[PDB]
Write a protein that binds this ligand. Structure first.
Ligand SMILES: [La+3]
Length: 452
């Protein structure tokens, strides 16, 4: 049943996992070069993020060992501040997917415990949640570096809280996140469906007006408009309307073409001024566009999806290591001697992020064009060649443009095993019934949830 490239993904997962087991078991993140670990939640983050990946890959003895850790060692009462968004997409989503795939009620019981501890974040005058909540003390607060919550953060928790309410029969989770969605539906200050990056919890209004990105702090707002619509059985038309409007806004304001290859890319807008800067995070968008087309969105979305998938591929393959940097810049006009994909010296790191292989999965599932599998295999071979740590694990690197000295940062992010390897395994599968597009939607940390 497993094909050659899938066996390759499993090889990579188990080399990653033996570093995690040997040097970071029960801890949030492996630091593979130093053979140690780091904590920021203190909640076995990498383990929880990889539960469903282990199940999907057939790694059942490993899953059972991880299940025993959740049963005995996972406890939520420590005095620790957590980011509501990261907690929700990683830990709440990871537990809910582990429940659905395994059927083991332990994961749901941990999910409900955790969900309850996140609820104080929503006690704001506007009901738009605070950014941070202490799962042990019950205090929630805004960040220190800014007074506002982040738009993607308060709009990328809905799938998880909705599903938790459906499974527990406790309406408070769904009611809290749906208030956020309805309120933002009615806010002023969008540009043709494009949202600002920040939102004030006291006034409920957008801040940082006139500055529009589809990268960090805005990207998954658009992703979850579509995915919530799919999740709820395509009856919540306001979600679809705001999604359709947003894609037209992307077309009108953010799309330009590179030189020399005329690649379609998405840039940023600040107070009317275009910037040809594209986070690797924006590479979520071709996958989301294609997912929409599978579910009835117009064919123009697939035209755009295929152009952007090619661009995102080139963001990887035009680098010396074959791995995309964190941020790329594009030239609107010809520059002698330059490739399409420019990268600032400070932006040359790769943190093993999943968004290109994320989108290849959907492009393959919807089109059947096997070149998207070939491109994913190419990217995985680059990960193997430049980020592998002999003792175990894989590391973020500081320089995708120096194949002799990529400069490991000594960290394996939980989304390498939660997302990057999961999307690759699915991309290579010969089975369209494996986590079918008709039956599940993935949350923004690649944790599948059932369509209602
Ligand atoms: La994501």
């Amino acid at each position: 049943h497993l094909n050659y490239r899938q066996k390759g993904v499993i090889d990579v997962f188990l080399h990653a996992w033996k570093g995690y087991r040997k040097f970071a078991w029960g801890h949030d993140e492996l630091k593979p070069v130093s053979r140690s670990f780091s904590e920021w939640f203190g909640l076995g983050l990498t383990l929880i993020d990889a539960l469903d990946t282990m199940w999907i890959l057939g790694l059942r003895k490993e899953f059972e060992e991880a299940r025993k850790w959740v049963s005995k060692k996972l406890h939520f009462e420590k005095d620790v501040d957590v980011n509501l968004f990261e907690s929700t997409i990683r830990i709440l989503g990871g537990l809910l997917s582990a429940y659905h795939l395994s059927g083991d009620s332990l994961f749901l019981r941990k999910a409900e415990d955790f969900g309850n501890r996140l609820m104080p974040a929503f006690r704001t005058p506007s009901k738009i949640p605070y950014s941070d909540v202490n799962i042990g003390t019950g205090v929630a607060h805004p960040p220190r570096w800014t007074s506002d919550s982040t738009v993607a953060e308060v709009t990328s928790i809905q799938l998880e809280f909705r599903e938790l309410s459906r499974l527990t029969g406790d309406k408070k989770f769904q009611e809290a996140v749906e208030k956020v969605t309805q309120h933002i539906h009615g806010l002023s200050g969008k540009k043709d469906g494009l949202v600002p990056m920040f939102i004030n919890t006291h006034s409920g209004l957008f801040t940082h007006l006139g500055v529009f990105t589809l990268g960090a702090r805005a990207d998954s707002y658009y992703e979850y408009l579509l995915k919530q619509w799919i999740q709820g059985g395509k009856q919540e038309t306001q979600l679809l309307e705001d999604y359709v409007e947003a894609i037209e806004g992307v077309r009108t304001h953010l799309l330009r073409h590179s030189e020399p290859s005329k690649l379609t890319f998405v840039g940023e807008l600040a107070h009317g001024r275009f910037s040809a800067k594209m986070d690797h995070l924006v590479c979520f968008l071709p996958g989301t566009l294609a997912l929409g087309v599978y579910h009835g969105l117009p064919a123009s979305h697939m035209e755009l999806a295929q152009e952007l998938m090619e661009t995102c591929y080139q963001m990887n393959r035009q680098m010396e290591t074959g791995l995309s940097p964190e941020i790329v810049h594009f030239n609107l006009y010809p520059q002698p001697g330059r490739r399409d994909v420019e990268v600032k010296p400070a932006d040359r790191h790769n943190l093993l992020r999943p968004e290109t292989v994320e989108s290849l999965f959907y492009l393959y599932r919807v089109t059947g064009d096997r070149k998207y599998q070939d491109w994913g295999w190419e990217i995985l071979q680059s990960f193997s060649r430049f980020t592998r740590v002999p003792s175990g694990g894989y590391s973020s690197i500081n320089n995708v443009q120096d194949p002799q000295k990529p400069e490991p940062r000594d960290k394996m992010e939980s989304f390498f095993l939660g997302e990057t390897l999961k999307y690759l395994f699915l991309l290579f599968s010969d089975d369209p019934n494996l986590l079918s597009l008709d039956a599940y939607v993935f949350n923004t940390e690649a944790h599948p949830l059932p369509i209602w």
